[PDB]
Every structure is written in structure tokens, then in C-alpha cells.
């Protein structure tokens, strides 16, 4: 049982949805009961996500060993069950980092490192690290097939092909079919060049994905396989849906599954796309609609809450309602007041680090507990809810978190090293999975059907346990605690329909097709405060 | 007084000389009485060639600040006078690590780092450190145009070229013009491909070095004018030719540095090459000739011992004598015995590291002593010379160093931690250039014609301090000591005609046009010896 | 039985050998029984390399049914038997021609006429034509991989592998592997750039031909295996040789035709190049040696005349006489005199056009006719010679042809329709290809050819003049040879003279290694027995 390898990369442009095409085909090839995993080749000098800004790359996705990665893994679980690790994605800074320190070290034994094979070699060991054990291997290049940064990827695939053979191994290349206005028709030439582009390199392409606004007629797909030594059956047309639930029911209609499975000598039954008809059918029809506010910093650009988006969405499915989010600036409520807070079916304050904005995400959240809007809080969420509370209604005058302000009287959120009291007085970053206990006869206990529950993490600031009992007696319930230190993960106020606040990232644990407990009585709140308007 | 730079690149295939035809260039112009210097840009992963080895990559060439660069350095000084430091050398490796240090950091502020303008910011930061406060600055690109190793480099100096203009910069390419048997005719056609590929990056190249084994005829550099957007008379040829020293008047006959000099808008005298006329003369023009032979363990790669070949020229050309250098094998010695060395006017042992082979650089140190043959000896080369006067004139059995034998009796040569004595009793990696101090009445005063001298060391093991007086009273004299701890340094037998061995790496500092004082006493005693065969 | 088709590319520069190298492979294919053929695509402009000057291209080939082509198959006919014929070499202003053509009468049907698919598959179609009925069919594209007069060919033959299939075609490119004396290695960088550039146009290449002035060692081979995608037994080594009759045993040790007949699956014996090492044994075991000079017009460059100077290799291994060709300048004859004549042991005067440097032919054919030293005159070489023979024997002075002077008064070579007496009386033309030849009985031409009748091929335009020929006949001048209905005269002898023949026809033409040429043969026998004379 040889493991086979799918190379995917993109020419013409970079906004081509090569993770979500990726992700795709892996879900039908899943479906027809092969074991299968995505691995994602970042051209970025950065060593790992976890020192860049939401703003500018997107949200920080987490896996369950605690590896701070690309987005674009998100897509990889919410397509297919195999778990991501830290083997499923690496970058250029990644690469030098090791070649450099084994250069220092002497392993190389006073050769002249280079950048064939020492760089090179470094990229096909962590390719096959994390993909032998498998049956079929997806493996997308960033970045676009004729620049600088992807090189060291596309030569080192080409060396895997010529040893691992053609027998089992496939390069499937994205490229973009421009829609003119002027001639009425599709211009093919964009991906003709990219084409040459890519065998100047070395690499032949076997598939190629054609992007478009609309489906690339027979004509054009027959000149393109004409230009590029491509069968016309291996063109395949993929064009922009409103949903990606239907990127693999189209991609198996065109047969991409058959010609994969035919090269690779795989003998499995047909794809079962059930499940994923069965999502289509639930967001093409959804019986109510609410209006769901999402206050953040980030909100400037909406992929740093790239995985709560979708969340909310999977929400929406188990419950059968439209949800439309809104993005709403946690600094213009600080500006403008409670005003742009009116209107909403519900109220969700994502995470995030630094003090921009959190005293509007603090006013937010008493907006929302003083008349019964059902609230939702991850990370920042449960601190900003816990503040005021401990503001308002355990009256501790001007309580906040040692991050914000670190000489602040009332600590409710601080380092485990940085917990004292009102007084001074003392005691004698978790990324990935932990589990964590829930208390009986709480809103979360019913809702996770469970009595322990295993979520990820991604935060330094905890709950101040010195400064946790006076809250309690003012009302405030706690749900969730974890560790031997017993950390609070999830706090509630029960004089309330719904409100729930949690230190965990449930975001990262939210498919389509299952969903998630916490999102789905979060949504399903939010109708019921609709109905009674 | 804008700095102007010359950017010179090369094509087709590696062999260019591209060190060479710059640091000749860089001689014409330094004799026009401008302020020029040079630069190498190595494109390996290796953070500096400190730990590469001779077999591999060639001599480690030793600026006077202690650098360990490429051995293209050495023609730079060897050509000019102005001296090389750490920023005129660096690599594709330390680029990286500078980049990625400040992204582990935190001093790009959560922005994503990437080859442009990350990486390429980095590269020209160095370049305008390293340039800045010259007329000319030439800058060596290594490899060859059209790798994936010299892009970063190639993008940018691309984008200096933009923000500098093209008033103060040049593009300087080499390239090859081979000779066909077939047809008799030198062929253009690599040079045609090789600018298509330089403009492929976004570089217009603006002086072409036809590199062959016969001058470039005009028909041949009219056509190559035409296809690559180049004067007539920027096509410069640069023919093989039996001594580099050469070159500089062969590219003056040809007007490069007169375009050059019109560019940049520079003003200065005719170029004076009245020192290289006479280099030339003198090597021409010699009057004896003896076999000097060289025993080492790196002589199956001869450009591992670079500059000391090139300051045994340099000691001939003051000598007026025919140098022929013969490279032996000290494994040979051990093997075959001294019958290798019979027919030799003189005995050179250059340094070197490791046990393999050392037996016989003594053995061969031993023989040059027995017959009062010419001997120099150079950092390892003074270590066997003392291990032999020890271990046979001073009867110390089994005499070695720490490096070879770690628990040898007499440990003559070692760290300065490891210094002990015969019976076990102690006392209550030095790179760069040191002050020594010359012992009166020794045969290193008389030549060096001066109390203190400077050289430039890369060493660990020194002489055991603890055991020189016992040798010092067997015969053996001290030359020359340094530091406040008192290092030997120079190390002499009296009872011989030449008999000299040093710390330091005199070779370092040899020039074709003032030579050098150590290697010019050492030639003349070879010929001396050769009178009285 | 499906046909087979092996591309021949050039990269880095174009003086590769790609002919050579090509009939040294379908040498070997032929020797495994297989049905091999060769055709050049010449990248130029010129619809036939007729219109094209000797000191440009070199010489022009001709092919018995009369096409001028490209020296390169002068190649083929000397390595396979296969008869090369029109449809085995065209050029790109041949391709260009037939398009605009079709185009002018409507055959594209309002159509807008385009490189794709218009060019490309008149290319298809031309060799399919000289491509199909055989089972192996070697296509040589000319010019340099990179440059834009080949690319309408590689995108015509990337088109056909495409529809073909991999099972019957490949593609063979030749390189350049410098050695650098700097480094005392060779240099694979620029065939790495070369591939690069042939990916780029679409095309993967499946064999390598690495060319050098000396082996290419395993580990540059399996360097340049690593970066173009290339098994490493699919890297041949080819030398600089001295004698380019090895090539095909240096081709057969490193195992190119197994690999070829892997790939196209056919089932053929090993090759026998028995024959080819006979070749070598001749050439490498000669037992005198002479110096032959070739007084002509052209020696600038010497591949003008290529087919003349291989025949007289040719005629050396039949005799094993090791022949020392001297090529000589006919106007230093005129300048310098026949000084420069003295020490040659035979002289022949090749063809050729134009008025320049021919009284200094004439001067030369009368040298070798006076002193009796061996001589050989293919065309011109003839007209020179009955000039000679009518200007200083029959006492015709100022006899010349019209060509060079068109109003003279004995004019012995002219056109058929020029044909005139020295009184002014008249009586009441590109000949190309294979003709027949008449010989007379008591002639030298008779015993050498041992045949009533000869078949040779023309290239000339001026032919001799039957109006004044019996005054000559009377002089003393034998005719050896006539053809046709008119009875124009192709070969002329002097009897008083040991070895002295002159042709119209160019014999070179039908020279081989293998078997030689009758007219050579005896031309190179006389030239040693005149050496052993003195
Ligand atoms: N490698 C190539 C490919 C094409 N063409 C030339 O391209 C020309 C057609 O140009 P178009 O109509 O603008 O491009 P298209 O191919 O139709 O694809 P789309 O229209 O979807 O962008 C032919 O004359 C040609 F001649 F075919 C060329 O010269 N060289
Ligand atoms: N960009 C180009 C350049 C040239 N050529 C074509 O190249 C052809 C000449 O090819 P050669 O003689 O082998 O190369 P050379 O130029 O003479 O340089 P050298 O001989 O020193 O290597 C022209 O017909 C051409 F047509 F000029 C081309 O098609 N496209
Ligand atoms: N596609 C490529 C190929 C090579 N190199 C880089 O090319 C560099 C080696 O340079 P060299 O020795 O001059 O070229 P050679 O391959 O050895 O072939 P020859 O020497 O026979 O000409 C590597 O560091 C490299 F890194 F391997 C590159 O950057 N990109
Ligand atoms: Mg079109
Ligand atoms: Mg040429
Ligand atoms: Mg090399």
C-alpha cells in the first residue's frame, strides 16, 4: 500500500480557494472510504502564525497537539474527520530555521549547504513526515507558480515525483478563466501562460481547476487541454457558488474523483455524498432568520474571525435559521453608546489580545445582561462578561485585567504568577485540547449531554481564583473548571435566558456536518428572543 | 558625493572569474586615485564559511577583523588597498538569520515576513552599509543567473537600481563565448539566452565580459550588441590569459574604465598602471628557477591552500625566480617515506586541522632539519616543526599535541586550558589580526625590519608554555611572542640555513606588488640552496 | 503497424552535429533490421536552398529526383541506404509559401489564418508525408531551442506527440557540455538552461545527447539526470571523435538503441556494424600516403565542398592511401602563378559560378595537363578543362563561356539556346537529379564504371557546345560520355596523359564509405602511383 500524493497549486492570481478545492476533493475522496490528509506549504518567512496580526494574515487557527497554524487547516477539518497536527503545515522560516541550526551544529559535516538538496531535502521530509501512513496525500503549494517564494516548494516536489514515480503522484494547478465584458467570453490565455510558467520549472500539470465567475464551456476546456498536454477529460470547471457545501458535489459530477483513482490504482466504491446533501438542503432552506452582532476589534477585516463566522453558521443549521451576522466595532460603542447595540436577536464578543476596544466589549456585555439578550463569549468574551459583572453587580469599582491595567485594585483576570487580591495579598499560554469538567444541573452540562468535554486553547490570562468566591455570592455561577489548579473555563448568570461565556476556542470544533452544542443553543436562543418581539 | 555602485553578475556557466575580472576593475580605477571597494554576495546557506571545509570550498580567507569570508577576498586585496572587514562578505544564511532573529522577536510588529521586502530590505541594508562613504562600490553576485539561489540577491539590486538611478549604477554580466572545433568560430548564442534571462528578472545589463579562451572578434561582439540593447563599446573581451596580472591592462586598452567613469559622471587622471607593468615584467623575466614542494593533507584540492601558492609567487617576483610549486601528499610520506622528498630546493607545511596525515608533516620537517633544506612552516606547520625538534633533539618520547593524542606525556602543543607538564602539573579560537613582538638578533628581525609586526591568526591550540624552556634549552630559539600571556609565535633552528615556523597566516597579507618580507627571505634561501647542488 | 517518431532538437549553440548524430542512430536502427528514414527542418526563409550561395550554408545537396536540399542529407545518404527525396527536407518559407497560397484561393474558407493551426499543421502534414510507411522516422529541427525561427516546429511536434501518444515518439536533444580550463571540470549548467527552456515551449525531453571535447563523466550524467527529469541511462556521452564512423559504436555501448526499441516495443535482433568497424580498420591501416590539392573558388569555407572532399576520403579507403587534401585559391593562381601548384601528387577543380577566379582554373587544368599530373574536374571542373584543351591545343584563343563572356568568339560552354559558330551560325535549362549516362568503350570512364550505362546527378545550367566540339574532337580530346536526345557531352579525356578526366555530373553526390565511388577510386589510385614516380 504505496501512500500517493496530489500536488495543488495555483498560477494567474492568489485568491483562488486552492485550501477550499483541496479540502474538497478530500472529502469525496473520503467518501469513498480512503484515508486521506491535507498538508498546507506556506512561503512566509515567519516561523509559525503565532507572531502575526489578525489584521493582516487572518485568525490563528489551533489544532489539538497546540500548534499555531494557517486558516486554511480550518477548512481541512470542517471538509474531512482525520485530526491536523503540526505536521500538516510548515513554512519557509520553518525550513531555514532547521537547515540553519544543523548547519551551525555541523551536521552537515563542512559541505556547503545549499539550496539543492540541503533546502530542498528539508522540504521533502517534512512532506513525507506527515503524509506516509495515508492513502492519499493532498499537498497545497502557497503562494503563485512564478514567483520568488514558492520555488524551493515546486523544486522539491519535483524531485518527489521522478523518485516516488508518476505512478502515484498528481499535480493538480489551479488557474483563474477571466470573464470580459467586451467580447462576452472567457479568456483562456491567462491560464496558457501559467501553464508554461509552471514547465519552466519542470513540473507537467495532469488536472487542471479552472476558476471562474461561471462554468467555462466545453469549447474553452478543449482549447486549454490542447495548449498544455493535458486530456480534455482532466480540465475541470469549477466555478464561484454562494456555498462551498456544493464544491464537492461538482467536482465529483466532472468525474475528478474517477481520473484520480484510475491513476492511483484505487479500487473503492462510489462517493457517498449524503451528508453534504443533506447540508446543502438545510441553508438552501431555512424557516426563520435572526439578526446576530458580533462585536470585536478585529472587525476591519472579517477573516481574523474566520472560524466564529462559520461557526454561527453551522449554528444556523441544526436550528434551521438564517442567521445574519454584523459586524460591529466594539470602539464605535464606546464612542457612540448602546445605540448600535439595538436591533440584535443576540450579542458575541470573540477573543483578542490588547486594550483597543475592550471597554466597549465591557458595555456591550451589560447591554446584554441587563436586557435579556442572549450573549456568547470566547476568551476576551468571558473576560470582558466577568468584568462586568464583578463591575456592576458585585460592585468592585473599577475591576479589570492585569494585561489592560496592571496596577489595577480589583485583578479579576490575570497570570497565574499575577494573582494577589484587593489588598496585595498572594499565595504560598495553554494552546491544544484539555479536558475540562462541567457542573451539574448547568445551562452546558444539558447542552453538551456530557460530564467532561475536551476544548482548545489559546490564551495566558486566567480567571483570579482569590477574587472568584466574591462573585459567586453576588450570583454568578461558574459551569466549567479544568486542571489541577482548577481554572475557571466557563462562567453563566442564571438569572438570565441565555449567557454563556467560555475561555476555550469552541470555534475550532464546529463542523457543518455535526455542528457544535454550544453554537447550536446559542442560535436557537437567539430565535426564541426573536419570536418574543 | 553620491557613492555609485557596479553590480556585476554572471552567466551561462559559473567559471567566470567573476572575483577576479572585479578586482581588477577595482584596480583601474583605484589608479585613477578613486576610493574604491568590493563586495561579495555568497548564495549559500552556510552563515559564514567558518565551517566549511578547504576539500570542499577552498582556503577560509581571514580578514584583519577577525572574519572568516570566502576566498575571493583575497584576490580584493591582492589587487587593491583597501581592507576587507566583515562587511564585505556575507551569505544567503545570514541573511535569514538576521531576518528571522527579529521576527522571533517581535520587530516587525505582526506583519507577514516575506521574501519582498523582508528579505530583500535586509540584503540592501548590507549592501549600503558595506558601500557607503566610497566613489565606487563593486558588488560580486555570486552564482549563476537563472538559479533559484540568486534571486534575492538579483530582485534586490534590482530595486537599489531604481531608488539609487541609473546616474550612479551599472550592470556589469559576464558571460561565456565558447570556441566550436567544428566550425572554428567562437559562439554567441550562450550570451543571447543568458541576457534574456538577466531581463526575465528586470535587469538591463549595461557592460558585457565575454569570458573565452581567444579574444572576442568585433563581428562576434557587434552581433552580441545587437540582441541584448548594448553599446558596441560596452562589450568588453576578456580572453584567457596565463597571469591575472594582466587583466587590468587589458580591460584599460579596451575603455571600461573610461565608460565607466563618464556614467558616473567622475572626473580623474588617466589610470596609472605603471605597478602592474612591472608585476608583469618581473614574472616574465626570471633568472633562476627552483622546486619548492609543499606537503599537506588539503593538496587534493589546491585552491585549499589559495594564498599561500599565490605569496610563493609573490616571494619569486622580488627574487626574480621561477617558482615550481609541487603539491605532495603528507599520507604519502607515511606511507612511502622520504624518498618523496628528495630533489627539493625547499620544504613548505601549511596549516590545517585534524590527526590524519600529521605524522608525516613531521617526518617531512624532520627531513628538512637533517639536510638543511628551506623550511616555513604555518600554523600547523610550526607544530610539527616542534614536535620533531621535542620529540628528537630534546628526547621527549611521543611528543604531540592535545588535538591528536589528548593524553599524550609531553603535550607540547595545546589549549591553554589543557596546559600541564610530564608528570600532570598545571598553573594557578583566536581569529584575526594581533601585534607580535620580534626577538633581537633572530633571522625574523633582520627580515621584517622592524621590532613589532601585525598578522592575522585562526588557530585554537597553542605552544605549551610549561614545556618551552626544556626545549629552548636543546638549541631551539624563540622569534617572536604576543599578548600578556606571553604565546609563542615564531620559532627558529639556529643551526640550519632557513629554518623559520609561525602562529599566524602570513599569506594573508602577501601582495604581487610589495610581496612579503617572510616569503621573500624563504625563496631567496631555496635558490641559495639549488647554488650549492 | 504503427510508425514511430524520434525528434532531434539542439540546445545551448548550434554547431552540434544534430546531422551526424542522427544518421549515426537510424545507422544502428537500419542494422536491426528496421525501415529507418531521416528529414531535416531547416528554420530559414529560402524556399529551397537553391537560391542560396556555397559560402553561406555550404554545398547543395542534390537528390535523385532532382530537389536542392540541405548538406545535412548528404549525411543520411552516407550512414543509411535509404533514398532521401524532396519530401525530406523543407523549410519554413516552403511552409509559409503553401499557406499563403491555399489562403489566396479560399481554401480556408473566410477562415483567419493563424500560426495555430494553420502553420502547425502544414508541418504535420509534410511529415507524416516523408514519415509515414517506415518504422522508425528521425526528424531533425534546425536551429537553436530558444530562439523564434523554431518555435512554429516545436509547437507543430509537441501537437503530434500529443496526438500520436508517448508509445511511438521521443524526443532527443543534444547539448553542449563545455569544459572550463579555470576549473578542470565541464559544465552541465547550460544544458540545465536549455531544458528549462525546452519545458517552457511544452516539450519533456527523453533522451539526452551530451556533446563535448572529451567523455562526459557518470557524475555530470547523473547531475543532469537529477535536474531535468531525465533517467540517468538516458544520458548518452558524445565525444569529439576524429573519425565520425565510430559514432555509431559509441552510440551502441552506452545502450541508445535498446532504450529506443524499449520505448517503441519492437522485437529486433542486435546490431551488426560489421561493416562500420571494416570502415575503420581501412581507415586506420593505410599503406601510402599523397597529397591531393582542390583548386577552387569557395575554400573560405570548407563545407562548400562537402560531398567532394568526403568522396576523396572515400576513394582513399579503397586503395588505403591516406589522402592530405590542400585546398587551393583559384585567384592566387591568377596573382601568384602555378607556383603554388608544385608538390601535389593530383589536382582536382570542383564546381561552381561566376566569372571570379576562373582563369585561374583554366591555368590549373592546363598545369596538370602539361606536367601529367593526375586531374579530376566536375563540372566547372570540366569547363576549365575543354577551355584549356580549345584555348591552348586546338588554338582557340580567347575561348571562353558565355556565361563569363557572353559575346566571344569560340564560345565552347553556353546555353542550348545560345549555341553558336565563330562566324555567328546557329543550328536549325536547369538540369537537377538522376539522369542516364552513356559511356564509350575505349574509354577510361568504361573499365572504372565496368558499365555500358551510369546514372549520376546534375546541378548545372551551361552545357558544352556541340557547334564547335568536333573541332576540339580533331585536337586530340576524347569523349567519354554522352546522355540524352541532343547528345550533350559529360565526360571528357585526354589520352596522352595518365590520368585525366572531366565530368558534368557531380559523382560526389553517390559517394559512400561503405562502398566508395568508381570515378574516386581510380582518381586516388593514379594519385599514389604519381607519387611513387618522384
Ligand atoms: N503558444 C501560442 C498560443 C496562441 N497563439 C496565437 O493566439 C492567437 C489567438 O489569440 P486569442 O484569441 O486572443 O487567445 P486564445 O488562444 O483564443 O485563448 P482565449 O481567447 O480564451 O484567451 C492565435 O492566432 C494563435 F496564433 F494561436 C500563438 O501565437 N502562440
Ligand atoms: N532572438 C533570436 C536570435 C536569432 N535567431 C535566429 O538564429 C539564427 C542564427 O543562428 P546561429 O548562427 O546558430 O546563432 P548566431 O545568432 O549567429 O550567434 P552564434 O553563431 O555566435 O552562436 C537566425 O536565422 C536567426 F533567425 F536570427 C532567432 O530566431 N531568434
Ligand atoms: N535549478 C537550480 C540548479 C542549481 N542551483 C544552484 O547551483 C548551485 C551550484 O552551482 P554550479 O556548481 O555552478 O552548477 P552545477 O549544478 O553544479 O552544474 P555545473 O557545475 O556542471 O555547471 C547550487 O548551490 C544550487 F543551489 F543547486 C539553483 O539555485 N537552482
Ligand atoms: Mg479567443
Ligand atoms: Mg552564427
Ligand atoms: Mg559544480
Same mark, same amino acid.
Given at each position: ?6 500536488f495543488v497549486?495555483g498560477?494567474?492570481?492568489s485568491?483562488?480557494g486552492?485550501?477550499i478545492?483541496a ?5 469525496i475522496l473520503?467518501?469513498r472510504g480512503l484515508?486521506?490528509?491535507?498538508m498546507k506549504?506556506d512561503?512566509?518567512i515567519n516561523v509559525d $502564525?503565532?507572531?502575526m496580526?489578525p ?6 487557527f489551533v ?8 486558516? *486554511?487547516?480550518?477548512h481541512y477539518?470542517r471538509?474531512?474527520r482525520?485530526?491536523?497536527s503540526? #505536521? @500538516? ?11 540553519l541550526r544543523?548547519? #551551525?551544529?555541523?551536521?552537515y559535516?563542512?559541505?556547503?549547504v545549499?539550496v539543492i538538496?540541503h533546502?530542498t531535502?528539508?522540504?521533502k521530509?517534512?512532506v513525507?513526515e506527515g503524509?506516509?501512513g495515508?492513502d492519499?496525500?493532498?499537498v497545497?503549494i502557497?503562494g503563485?507558480v ?6 524551493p =516548494?515546486?523544486?522539491?516536489? #519535483?524531485?518527489?515525483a ?5 505512478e ?5 494547478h489551479?488557474?483563474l478563466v477571466?470573464?470580459?465584458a467586451?467580447?462576452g467570453e472567457?479568456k483562456? /490565455?491567462?491560464?496558457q501562460?501559467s501553464?508554461?510558467?509552471?514547465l519552466?520549472?519542470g ?5 487542471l481547476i479552472?476558476?471562474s ?7 474553452e ?10 486530456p480534455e ?7 464561484d457558488? *454562494?456555498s ?6 461538482l467536482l465529483?459530477?466532472?468525474?475528478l474523483?474517477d481520473?484520480i483513482?484510475?491513476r492511483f490504482s484505487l479500487?473503492?466504491?462510489?462517493? @457517498?455524498?449524503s451528508?453534504?446533501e ?7 432552506n431555512?424557516?426563520?432568520?435572526v439578526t446576530?452582532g458580533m462585536?470585536?476589534?478585529?472587525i476591519?477585516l $472579517?477573516?481574523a474571525y474566520?472560524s466564529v ?7 444556523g443549521?441544526?436550528?434551521?435559521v438564517?442567521?445574519?451576522?454584523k459586524?460591529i ?7 457612540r453608546?448602546?445605540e +448600535? ?5 443576540? +450579542?458575541?464578543?470573540p477573543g483578542?489580545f490588547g486594550y483597543?476596544?475592550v471597554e466597549g466589549?465591557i458595555?456591550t456585555?451589560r ?5 435579556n439578550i442572549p450573549y456568547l463569549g +470566547?476568551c476576551?468574551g468571558?473576560?470582558?462578561a466577568?468584568?462586568? !459583572?464583578?463591575?456592576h453587580?458585585?460592585?468592585?469599582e473599577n475591576? @479589570?485585567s492585569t ?6 485594585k480589583? $485583578?479579576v483576570?490575570?497570570l ?7 489588598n496585595?495579598?498572594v ?5 491544544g485540547?484539555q &479536558?475540562?469538567?462541567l457542573? *451539574?444541573?448547568?445551562?452546558?452540562? &444539558?447542552? !453538551?449531554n456530557?460530564?467532561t468535554?475536551?476544548?482548545?486553547? #489559546?490564551?495566558r490570562?486566567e480567571?483570579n ?9 453576588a450570583?454568578?455561577?461558574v459551569?466549567g473548571?479544568?486542571?489541577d ?7 453563566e ?13 469552541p470555534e =475550532?470544533?464546529?463542523? $457543518? ?6 453554537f447550536?443553543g446559542?442560535?436557537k ?5 426573536? /419570536?418574543?418581539?
Open positions: 500500500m504505496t501512500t500517493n500524493y496530489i497549486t498560477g494567474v492570481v485568491s483562488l486552492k485550501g478545492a479540502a474538497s476533493l478530500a472529502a473520503e467518501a484515508n486521506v490528509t491535507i506549504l512561503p512566509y $502564525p503565532g507572531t496580526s489584521i493582516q494574515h487572518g485568525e490563528v489544532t489539538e497537539d497546540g500548534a499555531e497554524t494557517d486558516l *486554511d487547516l480550518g477539518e471538509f474531512i482525520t485530526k491536523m503540526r #505536521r @500538516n503545515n510548515f513554512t519557509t522560516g520553518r525550513i531555514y530555521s532547521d537547515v544543523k548547519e #551551525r551544529r555541523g551536521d559535516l563542512g559541505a556547503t545549499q538538496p533546502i531535502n528539508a522540504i521530509e517534512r513525507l503524509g506516509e495515508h492519499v496525500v493532498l497545497e502557497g503563485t512564478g514567483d520568488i517564494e514558492s520555488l =516548494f515546486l523544486e522539491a516536489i #519535483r524531485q518527489m521522478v523518485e516516488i514515480g508518476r502515484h503522484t498528481l499535480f493538480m489551479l488557474t477571466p470573464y470580459m467586451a467580447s472567457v483562456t /490565455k491567462p491560464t501562460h501553464v508554461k510558467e509552471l519552466s520549472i513540473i507537467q500539470p495532469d488536472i479552472c476558476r465567475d461561471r462554468a467555462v464551456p466545453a469549447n476546456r478543449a482549447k486549454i487541454a490542447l495548449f498544455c498536454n493535458v477529460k482532466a480540465v475541470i470547471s469549477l466555478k457558488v *454562494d462551498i457545501y456544493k464544491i464537492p458535489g465529483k459530477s466532472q468525474g474523483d481520473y483513482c484510475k479500487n473503492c466504491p462510489e462517493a @457517498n455524498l451528508e453534504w443533506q447540508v446543502i438542503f438545510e441553508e438552501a431555512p424557516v426563520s432568520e446576530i462585536v470585536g476589534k478585529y476591519e $472579517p477573516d474566520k463566522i462559520e461557526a454561527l453558521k453551522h449554528g443549521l441544526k436550528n434551521r438564517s442567521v445574519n451576522i459586524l466595532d466594539s470602539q464605535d460603542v464606546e464612542t453608546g448602546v +448600535i447595540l439595538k436591533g440584535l436577536d443576540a +450579542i458575541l464578543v483578542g483597543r476596544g466589549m458595555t456585555a447591554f446584554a445582561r441587563e436586557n +470566547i476576551l468571558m473576560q470582558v466577568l468584568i462586568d !459583572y464583578a463591575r453587580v458585585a460592585n468592585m475591576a @479589570n494585561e489592560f491595567v496592571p496596577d489595577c480589583y $485583578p483576570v490575570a497565574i504568577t499575577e494573582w494577589r487580591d484587593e496585595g495579598n499565595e504560598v499560554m495553554r494552546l485540547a &479536558q475540562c469538567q457542573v *451539574d444541573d448547568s445551562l452546558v452540562r &444539558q447542552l !453538551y456530557a460530564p468535554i475536551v476544548e482548545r486553547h #489559546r490564551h490570562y480567571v481564583n482569590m477574587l472568584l468566591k466574591q462573585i459567586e455570592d450570583g454568578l455561577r459551569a473548571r479544568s486542571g489548579d482548577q481554572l475557571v473555563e466557563i462562567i448568570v442564571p438569572n438570565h435566558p441565555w449567557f454563556v461565556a467560555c475561555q476555550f476556542h =475550532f470544533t464546529s463542523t $457543518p456536518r455535526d455542528g457544535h452544542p454550544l447550536a446559542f442560535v436562543a437567539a430565535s426564541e428572543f426573536q /419570536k418574543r418581539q
